[PDB]
Structures are given as C-alpha cells and as structure tokens.
Symmetry: D2
Subunit: 376 residues, 4 copies
C-alpha cells in the first residue's frame, strides 16, 4: 500500500500562529512556571490578533514577543506580503473563567478528552517515515533560506511525501511534493533545479528514490504571494502535522499556546513518551497508546495499548508495564517529564515528536521496561 503525510514550514500562516502562541507561553513560563495559559492567535494580511485566557504573575510584552517571533521566521518586508516591524498586534486576552488537593499530584484533570501516542521502529527517531521526512524537507528549506545558500527563498512552504509499504516494511518513496515561496528574481526552472539539489537530494535517502518516484516542485508555478497575505493562520490548525502525519490517531486537542496543565498537550507528550520507550525497549515494532480523562478526575478514565500484532511480549503484560512505570495523572505527567520550563516555542514548527532533545523523546525507561519483562 501507499501512505502519505505532509508538513509546513515556519512561514506557513497556521504555523506562524502556533509559534506566536508558544512564544507568549515561553515568555510567561520564564517568570511564572506555574502560570495558566490558553493563548489563541489569528493572523491575516497586516495584523496579528492574540487572544485567550491567562492567569499569571508574569509581566510580558505581547507586541514585542510577536514581532520578534515573526522577525525570526523571516517576514521583515512588505515585498514578502508581511512585515514584523509594521504589522498590527492586537490583544484580546482575558482571565481564565471565574477545589485543590493536599497533594498536587492528585489534582483532577482540567478537562475531559482523549489523546494518543505512537512509535515505530521504521526510523531512527522511532517515528513514521512519511511525517519524518516531510518535516525534514521543510526544515531544510528554512535552513537553506536562512544561511544564505538559496537567498531568493521566502518563509512559506509545504511538503508532502508518499511512501510505499510492503508487509510493514518500507520499499521506497512514491511521490514528493515541495512548494516554496520565493522572490520575483528567480525563474521556475532554476527554482526546481535548486530545490532538487539543495533541499530534496540532501534529505531523502537515495535508496528510496527510484526512477518511478514522482517529484512535484512548485507544481502550479510562481509562488510569490505567501504567508498571512494569502491565507488566514490560526492556532491549532496543523494538529496532524504536529503529531504523526495521520499514521496514528488523534484525539483532537491542539498543542500550542497551552501550559502543561492542559492534558490535551501534556498527556499527548506523555503518550509519545510511553510508546517510544516501549518500542525502544524492543517490546514491539509499533505501538499506539490511548489515554482519556474526565474533568475533575486524576486517574485516566481509560488506557489502551495497541501493538498491531508486533508485540514481543503478551499485550496483557504491556498494559501492566505502562501502569507500573509511568505516572499518567495530569500533574504526574508534568513532574514525570519536567514540563514547567520555557521549551515550547521550539516545538511549534517541524513537529512536536521526533527531535530527541525534548523530554518526552528520552528513552530513559527502555532498559527498565526490558528488564521488567523477559529480560534481554
């Protein structure tokens, strides 16, 4: 069969909104690590609207956080359709809606919901190949735009990779899409050769690129208008890009702009952490975790482990190890993963999962899980 996933660059308007939301979150957590933050951003030609509810002792400058984020992304001139130095920034940020515990670890969930984690040993970083290489294509586009290798590139870009599988194994790459914004000073033919040479070939493994592979580079031609000029961007509209590219299920909650007390974000991080350590322990080839919560209840209402027939130990045992080695209570997750730190703007583009310096990507429980099962 074929499976397809996509990603978008840090200049895509939905991702601009995600990064502004988490830049606000980071600036707040730097002063007030216990802050409650629920920040929603809306970007369109000329303006950023930052809204939501915030409870914090922190004192932050929303305007400057927003301009600096957009400057880092690279929209700094009206020729690009958007300018961090001259766009409008509006705030519509209020307070969180008008009981506690002797042990904060026993705090009930702040909302109901369901979340999934996923891992698979088909890549080094234990992620599905399609989303992994889609992410690397747009990240390479930004890297090559920012270091001056291809200075006619502009921030907005989209990628899409179609993989072929045979009996759960990767046979190769069937189709690649790469669309990138660019200035007026480059023709489409020169663009396609440069993108192929400096973006696609350095990233996609040559063993997976046959002569049957289809390459769609700026398939409809010029791409000069981009970013918020062409399209609205909103926080939480790339939740599949943010996670597993559709290879795994998704419970619906957005990540960006939410402090770690929102189970939508922190329980999804914890579910990635469980699944990755199960696969890294060699207990399965691929593993999907579902957890759900009820508002006001600390213990998850459900925990499901799915291994698609690839488990190396009984699935009844895998469920036991998950409960034995992980604390999936709302504030348990926060403590287990040390989440009260300004680390979240970096997650808001190129994927929350896959990059092994995030705390939910550490495999520091794999050897323990292996020992607690039938040893090594």
């Amino acid at each position: 069969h074929l499976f397809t996933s996509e990603s978008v660059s840090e200049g895509h308007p939905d991702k601009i909104a995600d990064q502004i939301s988490d830049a606000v979150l980071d600036a707040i957590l730097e002063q007030d690590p216990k802050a409650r933050v629920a920040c929603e951003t809306y970007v369109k030609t000329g303006m950023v609207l930052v809204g939501g509810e915030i409870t914090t002792s922190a004192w932050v400058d929303i305007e400057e956080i927003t301009r600096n984020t957009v400057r880092e992304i690279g929209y700094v001139h009206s020729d690009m359709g958007f300018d961090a130095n001259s766009c409008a920034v509006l705030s519509a940020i209020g307070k969180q809606s008008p009981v506690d515990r002797a042990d904060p670890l026993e705090q009930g969930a702040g909302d109901q919901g369901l979340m999934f984690g996923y891992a698979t040993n088909e890549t080094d970083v234990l992620m599905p190949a399609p989303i992994t290489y889609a992410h690397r294509l747009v990240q390479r586009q930004a890297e090559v735009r920012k270091n001056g290798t291809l200075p006619w590139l502009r921030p907005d870009a989209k990628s899409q990779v179609t993989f072929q599988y045979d009996d759960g194994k990767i046979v190769g790459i069937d189709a690649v899409v790469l669309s990138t914004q660019h200035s007026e000073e480059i023709d489409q033919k020169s663009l396609q050769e440069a993108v192929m040479e400096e973006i696609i070939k350095p990233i996609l493994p040559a063993e997976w690129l046959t002569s049957a592979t289809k390459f769609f580079i700026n398939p409809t031609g010029r791409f000069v208008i981009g970013g918020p000029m062409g399209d609205c961007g909103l926080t939480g509209r790339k939740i599949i890009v943010d996670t597993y590219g559709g290879m795994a299920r998704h419970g619906g909650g957005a990540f960006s702009g939410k402090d770690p007390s929102k189970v939508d974000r922190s329980a999804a991080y914890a579910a990635r952490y469980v699944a990755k350590n199960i696969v890294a322990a060699g207990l399965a080839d691929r593993c999907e975790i579902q957890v759900s919560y009820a508002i006001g209840v600390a213990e998850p209402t459900s925990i499901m482990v799915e291994t698609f027939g690839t488990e190396k130990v009984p699935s009844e045992q895998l469920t036991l190890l998950v409960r034995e080695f992980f604390d999936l209570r709302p504030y348990g997750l926060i403590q287990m993963l040390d989440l009260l730190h300004p680390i979240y703007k970096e997650t808001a583009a190129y994927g929350h999962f896959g990059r092994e310096h995030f705390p939910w990507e550490k495999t520091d429980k794999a050897q323990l899980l292996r020992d607690a099962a039938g040893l090594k």
Copy 2:
C-alpha cells in the same frame, strides 16, 4: 466504583462530542452559515471563511470570490440566535455582540487560467490527506463511541430547546468510554456529561435531571451495568460558558466532526470551505466509499486514505484498510474504489451533488452518520457487491 487492579485487561475506547453552544462549534456554524448564504446565490463561489469568537465579539475573516451579496452581520446574529445565546446573563447575546469582518478577495496567484477542456480534469487547489471510515457496529455504519457521544449532546440541545429542562444553557460536552471484546461491543465503561445551566438549579437536581432526561433515553440499558462510571457536572456549577469563558475558532473540533478518534484524520477543517476544497469534499467522498464498501458487505470496518498534490487531478495516493474484516482481497477493493468512484476534485462535486447550501447543518453534531447527507447515501452498495462477485 471499580477498584484499581480489578480488570486492567479490558480493551477500552473513548470518544467525545460537544454541543452547538460550545465556542469552537459556534465558530464552525457561523463559517458554514456564511458559506450557505453565498452558495444560495452563487453555486460556483470560492469561500474560505474563518471565524473567531470571544466574549462580546465575532470576527469573520478569510477569502471569498463570489458574485453573491450577503449580510455578514445578519447571518452571524441569526446563527447565534438559533444556538440560544440571546441574553447577557448567559455570557453572550446575539443581538448586541460585535461583528467584525476581515474578508479578502483571494490571491492573484490563485489563478483562474490554466483551464481544462474537461472541467472534471481540473487539478486540486491544495495538497493534503483525508480519511474516511465506516464500521457495521451501528445501523448508520459509524463507530459507537462517537455516535452516542454525538447523541448525548444533541439530546441536551433537544431538551433545552423544547422546554423540558429550561434551565439548561447551550455550552455542553459529553464523553463515552466503550469496552470492546474481540471487535464487538460489550458495554459502556464510563459516561461524562457536563452541561451549562442557570442559577435556578442545584447540582443534585441537575444530576438527577441529566440522568433521566438525557443519559437514559440515549444509551441502551443493555450496555449499562453497575460498573459504569457516570460523571455528570463533575466539578459542580457550570454557569459561565460559551464564548464568555473560552475562545472559539473554526476548525478546532475536527475529531468531533469526523469519527471521535476511532479513525485517523488528515488534519483539514471542514467548516467555511466551499466544495472545491478537497479538505472537505474528499473527506466526504472518503466516507462515501467506506460506507458503501461496508454496506455492500465487502468488509466489517473500512478506512480510506486519499491525498492530493496542488495542480493535480488524480489523488496522489489511495489506501484501503479493512483490519482483517474484508470479504474479498484488499488489493481488489482498491481497484474497485479507483473505478467506481470519481475522486478527482470536480468529479467529487458532481458525484455527491455538492453545490448547494447544505453545510450549516453539518457544523454541529457530526458531518457523518446522518443519512440525508449526500455522502451518506448507500446507492453504490449493490453495484460494488456485484462487481466484486458476491
């Protein structure tokens, strides 16, 4: 009240829904109400309408290319009126809120050239991936947890609007945890129902009224045992709700909109998008083929992935997953799908007869499972069954 370490081996799956008064769903309804008003006048319109709702205000933005002439403010107020927010005591009033508009006219790069002799051969307007799903667990071929999660919050709307429980307010959320034993439904492990209300009711009267008027008329008694946990307003008072206490945005309930987590998702929102957006039309068509594959008796559960490249008419990929329940080889099912269905962008439109103002009704309680929608018709089931030789 089941102790820890009593079962642990039960296979559980949980899905949630939200009512038409939840702020994200309000935004979805406004975007599609604008879309419907436009399509009533201009069936070929291009619409990409994104709505932001907060305490006191609605912001309607996006990109629209149409000959239609619509009143954004009046469309917005009517939608919020019908949802039920018509007084400041509820935290939001349709008659006095602010309505702002930030609607542009789409890029010149979007281009209405590069045409096709056959319009059905026009390329997709964007890349992306979409999923469809069906399963014979229910009469409407939807997963149980999302189906009954939808039913509960729509039941709360029902009894709120007809005056059975007048002290209810629009904002509400439900959640249902089902237990499965080897593919089949054994029962319901946990039910969550949080509903906004007025000051004129205490929480004990609330919980008794919710169980008798909402939960019991919806969930089959055969799936309810002494082990079923019931969490009805589990944090107490729910007086402040709607846009007052939370932001609402178009496209922030896409899992509620589809299959409640049972099926995967490609990530595209539905509401505010005209039928030429494959994010919406291809997901509707993917539901159409999965439902017809299951209704034809060719599988018990079926998931379909399709993807597109901008400027390309044929899907860049088609995948059918039957989870071992197929009654014919799955590679044979993929061929049937490619030939019996037109998955090209404008082919979708003609196959599902999509150029009509039908979309506001989709924007709350699920785009799937209600059988008067065109993509829920099962008119290819016998044909598919014949072509597969059964």
Copy 3:
C-alpha cells in the same frame, strides 16, 4: 409657538452638552480612566490613549511609555459599569463586551535625549494652538449656554442614578438657546432635552417627568417665559442608545468639553493625554489665566490663544482678546500674562500641579466650570489686580 417674522432682531446663542452615556463620552472616560490608573503608579508616564466603542466592543489603542502595570480590561469594564451600561436590554453590557488593546510603545524618534539643564526649559512635544476663556456671566465665570447645557445632562444622570426616575437610560443630549441684549443675558429662547429610556414609560409621562425633575430644577424661572420653546424627546421613543446605535471615539466632543461654541478652539482633544501634551495642559492653563483675569476685575470676558512649535519651550504666540471689556489696556494684559504665568510645557505642569490621577472626572460634564480642578483656582486674581494697579 412664536410665529415667523415676530422678532428676528434678537441676538441668540446656542450651546449643547451630552451625558456620560453618550458613546463619544464613554470613549473619553475610558481613555482618561486608563490615564488615571497609570498616573497613580507612574506620575512621569507618557500616555496617548485613543478609544473606539461600538456595539459589543471597546478598542483601546494608542501609545504608552510607563513603568506602571495596569489592567486595561478591568479599567474599561469598571468605567462602563459606573456609567450604567450593565445589561443587554440597554444595548450594551460592561460585563460581557469585548475589550481589545492596540497599545504601542511610542516611536524611537520621540527621543528621551536632547535634555535640558533646567527641566522647565524642555520643548513642546508637538505644535498646535489652544484657547482659554472666561466671562463674568456666571458665578463660575463660564458662558451661560454651555454651563446650563452641562447642568441639564448632569441632572439627568443625577436623577437616573439615585432612583428618582429609574426608567432613564444613560445616553442623553441637551441644547440651550440664550437670548442676549447688549452683552447681558435676557432669557432662554429654546431648550432641547433628549433622553434614552426603557420600555416602561410612554412619551407623555416622559415629557412631564423631564420638565419637573430635570428642566425646572436647573433653569432659573426668571429666564423662562411663554416664548421659550421646549423640545423634550422631539422624535418620540429613545430606547436604543449608547454604543448600540452609534460609534464613540475619544476626542469627538471637544466643543462640549470646553465652552460650547462661545469661545474658539484649537482642535486638540483632551482625554487619554498625559499632562505633557500641550493640547490638554496649555488649554487648562489658558482657562487658568482667562479666569484669573476676569476674577481680578481686569475684564468682563477674556479669550486667550497660545500656540507652540515642537522642540520649543516658549509659546510661539500669545493673544488676549477682551472684546472691549478690559479695564486696563489690552497690551498691558498681554505682558502680565507672559510674566505671571509659566506657559512653558513643563512649567504648566508645576504651576497647575498636574501629575496626579484627576482626569477621569474631567471626561464628562465639562473640563471647565468645576472649581475643585487646579486650573479653576483663582489664586492669582489679587496679584494680577495689584500688578495692573487697581
């Protein structure tokens, strides 16, 4: 009911005012409430706060450089609460409206360099012209028409808030036409009073209640004859008002704010501006000198124009107009003004003790005529009279 062509020779002058619920005045009060909250913490703050109010929403924008830490949303809701808009039936509610902020941090070109050894020698922050005025027609040395126009709409607020006429709503406007005979007041030719109200009152009961509770306790009976026209709610029902039916903007009632048209105006708004803006402080000082010139008995009516150039401390022009009522040569009065008053930007601040949160109170019912304001003190009158030799 005076026929056309009956008098025609009467010299008439008309001025108007508006209540604290008129949408423009709401905006002025919000701008100065923000200014006051800032000055309470940071007396040296630079503030330029512009407010936009519309059905459902408040937009607070402008430029602010301060060490203060203020809650824009809470300051806004409290101000609207105190005005009286606290329910959607009135068309606007302080507790559920939207509050947006568009406040920047002032240009780097604004510059905090180019300093002065003596801070009183600092240059003006902008150019512009300003007027002040006084006249001994009234005990508070203000023109009659604006004084009694102010009084009527403040009387309507008074009887609305203390429950005398509870069916009144905040939005209201008054207008008074005086007849003059050779400089002195002969009487009142026409009175207009339009007030918003609730559904619980008809127009005949309204007009009788307005005449007995508002008009008669305010206007001296000696100025009311059988020829006085009274127009009380002359178009009938006034139920929709406030921001619901009209936009409100900071600085759109500058004639109401000053002298009702009797005196000229330089064009600068007052509200939302910290005391380093000569638009506000120099107008306050111009009132201060005109009032002291008249209180000293040096003229019966006195108008002052001052103007500034950006970067210049001394006014670029000073003009005193006494309309033939001076008791000393007018050129002598100009010299007295230049020496007895410090009209330099920061000199104004020290002379009037302006670095205090006193400004929200100015933003409705007039910046002039209320004698607890610093610029209404008449503490230089005897000095001016001595220096002129009387």
Copy 4:
C-alpha cells in the same frame, strides 16, 4: 496682536482616516445618492478599522476603496511604516439605529447641534490668512513630493503659520513651522534648504517675510517614522484644520464620513456659503454666522449674524437678507447647494473651505444681496 493656525498633509494619520471615510462616502453616493452614511475610521500601525452605520442600496468594496485611498496618499512600502497593499482592513459597519413629510424640504433635522460659517476679505478666497497659507504649505509639500521634485519626501507633514495683525490688517508673518517626513537618504541641512526653496518661498508672499520672521523646519531633526506607524489616526480629529484654523468658532461636529443629511456637515457648508456671499457682496469685511437645529425640527432654532463692527449696512438688515436669500432647512441646504454627488473625498485634506470649485464656495448670490441692500 498675533494669531496662529496649523494644517496637516494628506499623510497625517488623522487625515488618512478622514480621507478613507469620505472615499467610502463617495463610492456609495456614486450608486445611491440618497444613501445614509456615518463612517468612522481608525488607523494605527498595520491596520485600518472602518466602522459606523450605513443605509444604502449601493454595493461597494470597503477593502479596495481603502487600499486605493492609501495608495493615492503614498504609503506603499514598509520602509515608510505603512503599506496600502499589505495592511489589514477590518469592517465594523452596521445599520443605522432601528416620520416623513409630503415635502422632503420640510424634513426635520436628523440631530440637534450648532454650526458656524465665516468669511473675511483679507485673502482672495475670502478666508483667514493663517489657515489659508498653512493649508498651501502642506499642499505644496505633497505636490512637490508627488511630481518628483523632492522624491525623498514622505507623506506625513505638519505646518503652522503665525500672522501679525494691526487694526485688523495683516502686517506680516511672524513664525512658520514646517515638519515633514522623509527617507533616510537626506541630511537635515539639505532638507531645510530644499524645504525653504521649493515649499516655503513659492507659497508665502515675500512682502510678509521680513528678517524678523522665524522659520522652524523639522525643528527636532530626523522625521523618518510617520503616518499610522507613530500615531493613531481617527476620523473627525482635525475639525479646526478642516474649517478656519481657530479664527472662527466651531460647533463641534466632524465632517468626514457623513452624508449631506447630517446637518453637522451640510449646515456648516451652508454657513460658509452665507458668510462668503455676504463678504463678497461688500456688505461686511468679516462675517460669522451661527445656526442651530433641534432634532425633528426643520427651521433652524437660531440664526445669528456677527460682523465685528465691519458691516456696511445695518446688522438688522443683514439678518433679513440671510433669511430672504438662503434656505437653511436640512434638506433645503442639500437642494440649495446640490450636495448629492460624490465630491467629498477631495474635501478631506487641505481644508473644506477656501477652494472655489466646491459648491459652498460659489458667490452666485453676492450681486443679488448687493442689489437687495443699498445697491451698488
């Protein structure tokens, strides 16, 4: 004595708002001459908010009207701090608040209020000198910026002129202020010489410029940040610039964004028309008119004529001529001045009074007034 007045260019943010409001009014009147329009505009870094109440059968594109207006003004690049092609435009335009006459001329006033008109024979256009030459300085700045004579100029500019009077006669000009935005590529010394040579000297009469005249050209130095980038702009915040520069009184109503059924605008136009024709008829050297209205009443509640001792015929007679020759009822004004035409964007910068192609500047009643008095 000395008297001072100021003006601002079409690039000043308050005037940008005024011009957008009246550009919307003009586009509406072009299709629907009986439209009711009350349009308020708010501009700040990155965004234009267009609000108000409108009742019309017309179909107009607010976004395009706004971008075209700002393009004409000259803000077309982020280097200038504002760009018509990429700023945000938001609408908050509603409907006018939820009895008629057999004769529309007998319609009552739509609001109460007071308005003034003024004229004086001290200039050709029967306007006070200070506001007249202040207007001409900023209009010359824009003319010389747009025709390429001084292409480093930028749209935002302010002017101020201080005149000296002796017994009602002009003796000369005491002080001139001229501040202009400019690009980075000009030094302040070169700027001051060019402004003096190409802006000030061509405009101010040489007989009024002595060696005692003070010249303040960009008095605080560089002026690169301007327009909506530095300061909010709002409709109706230049009402003294719009009229007589403070030489005459003002009743308070703003002009821009209002259709001619708003007496605030149309009765002020009519009062200028009365005063100008009285002075043009040689019946006075200077003349101020006050009119007031009551809502729902067609006849003005008061009409006052003031001539400051300069009347050549009895003032009791001047009041008679005003009533005999002018229709000051709300819809009478509209018919007397033929106001239902898209002519109003042109008024929204450089003064509503003074330019003799506007209908309220025609002196077509002067000879009649002269004949009705003691003849010629």
